[PDB]
Amino acid sequence: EFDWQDPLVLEEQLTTDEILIRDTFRTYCQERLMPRILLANRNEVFHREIISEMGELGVLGPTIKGYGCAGVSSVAYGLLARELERVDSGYRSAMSVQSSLVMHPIYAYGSEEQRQKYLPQLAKGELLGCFGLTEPNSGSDPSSMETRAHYNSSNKSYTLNGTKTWITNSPMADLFVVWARCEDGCIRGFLLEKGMRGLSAPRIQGKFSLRASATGMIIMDGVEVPEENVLPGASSLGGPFGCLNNARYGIAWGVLGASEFCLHTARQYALDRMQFGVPLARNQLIQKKLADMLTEITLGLHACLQLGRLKDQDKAAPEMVSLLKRNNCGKALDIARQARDMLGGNGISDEYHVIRHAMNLEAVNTYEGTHDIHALILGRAITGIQAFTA
Ligand SMILES: CC(C)(COP(=O)(O)OP(=O)(O)OC[C@H]1O[C@@H](n2cnc3c(N)ncnc32)[C@H](O)[C@@H]1OP(=O)(O)O)[C@@H](O)C(=O)NCCC(=O)NCCSC(=O)CSCC(=O)O
Ligand SMILES: Cc1cc2nc3c(=O)[nH]c(=O)nc-3n(C[C@H](O)[C@H](O)[C@H](O)COP(=O)(O)OP(=O)(O)OC[C@H]3O[C@@H](n4cnc5c(N)ncnc54)[C@H](O)[C@@H]3O)c2cc1C
């Protein structure tokens, strides 16, 4: 008995579909992504095909019913992310934006005209989208964003002016989901397309985290958005925050895939590498580290499963997601760091991958709410007292 690869038997907790969905995607991730990550990460190269590839597999926007989507469970969504991050966080990051930050909002806040126009193409990966909320001056405080949208009564359009930075996929994006403060204090979502005059999405350089992922800006020089490109179901931060909750859930699951890759690598290395006439795995210090990695991964996995089930029941709450995203991200960051240390000198070579995961999880622990921000959200939901500001 006892399989360190699933010590608490999560396998018998998944339906046959979820399992088939996972292993199918896993064969792809290992066949089509794993062999390209080394150089993709080393030379910051994100192959656009990837999206097309994932789209035609139906892993894009999988919980959406109809519109060309898979219409699967939240758990299945988690399993998918996990398999992707097991390869690289960048990839998963591109897949999470597409699914939870582009399609979801279109589907839930958009009109039927937009749902029809965009959903099918995204689901197929024929349209790479991006989510623009963050601005050079607005990170943890999206309510201070400066991008403004001016309503033009004559043609019922909006003229957006602002700058979104640190936007995943913006550089090679076709569709843009920008959030801007309107002249009445409310904030609505605006669908922008590549080509619109006044719209540039330059790529950010010098990244030492999520390098295989294209990141850039969304500079809007008085871009005019038609009446039909405004998101009908928007009003204040609630809109992007609802999409965030979906994305954070995918991340909570994703980082577990990363932690697992590092455990496996460190464990295997601990077995093959010989020092002092024995494998490193014979040493107590080495064994305790393996014990901690497996311990946390396990705690996170089963917690994520329970959140999957609650999500599909619609009993899932926002602060639940904060708790796991925050937990899993920090815990995964440490696991990657330990594995790096456990491989000694070789650990600092991207050819041993652990370093790539340690660098990647640095960013993941920051976006979608920093570790401390999720501390304050949880803290506020516990005490009933706000402590973000003074
Ligand atoms: C929430 C906040 C901004 C705190 O600000 P606050 O003003 O005090 O928040 P708050 O007190 O919440 O007041 C503001 C408004 O937000 C509402 N709200 C909160 N959670 C919601 C949810 N789940 N669904 C719908 N609405 C929600 C809230 O009730 C109110 O709206 P309304 O009722 O309509 O009046 C902060 O805790 C936070 O979330 N900071 C994080 C910044 C952030 O959102 N970063 C993510 C950007 S995207 C990204 O990083 C993608 S990375 C790519 C990848 O996947 O790899
Ligand atoms: C690779 C990558 C991809 C990204 N992709 C996207 C994307 O597609 N879309 C998007 O909208 N955003 C995206 N982001 C941005 C990310 O969501 C934000 O960076 C993050 O939410 C806030 O960080 P910031 O850079 O503004 O830092 P800041 O908000 O300036 O925060 C900095 C530090 O201060 C702390 N802090 C902040 N406020 C408080 C407070 N009140 N009390 C106590 N401590 C506080 C935090 O712990 C954090 O460590 C991306 C970022 C990276 C690194």
Q: How would you characterize the overall build of this protein?
A:
One of its GO terms (molecular function) is fatty-acyl-CoA binding. Substrate binds at residues 92-93, 140, 241-248, 369. Pathway: Amino-acid metabolism; lysine degradation; Amino-acid metabolism; tryptophan metabolism. The strands form 2 sheets. Strands 1, 2, 3, 4, 5, 6 and 7 form a 7-stranded mixed beta sheet that branches. The chain has a two-stranded antiparallel ribbon with strand order 8-9. The chain folds into 3 domains: 1-128, Acyl-CoA dehydrogenase/oxidase, N-terminal domain (Butyryl-Coa Dehydrogenase, subunit A, domain 1, Orthogonal Bundle), CATH 1.10.540; 129-235, Butyryl-CoA Dehydrogenase, subunit A, domain 2 (Beta Barrel); 236-390, Up-down Bundle (Butyryl-CoA Dehydrogenase, subunit A, domain 3). It is globular, with a radius of gyration of 21 Å. 49% of the residues lie in helices and 14% in strands. Helix 6 (238-272) packs antiparallel against helix 7. The chain has helices at 16-42, 49-55, 74-85, 89-109, 112-123, 238-272, 284-313, 318-342, 354-364, 371-383, and strands spanning 129-132, 148-152, 157-168, 175-182, 187-193, 199-200, 215-225, 274-275, 278-279. The chain binds 3-thiaglutaryl-CoA and flavin-adenine dinucleotide (FAD). The site of flavin-adenine dinucleotide has 22 residues, from strand 1, strand 3 and helix 10.
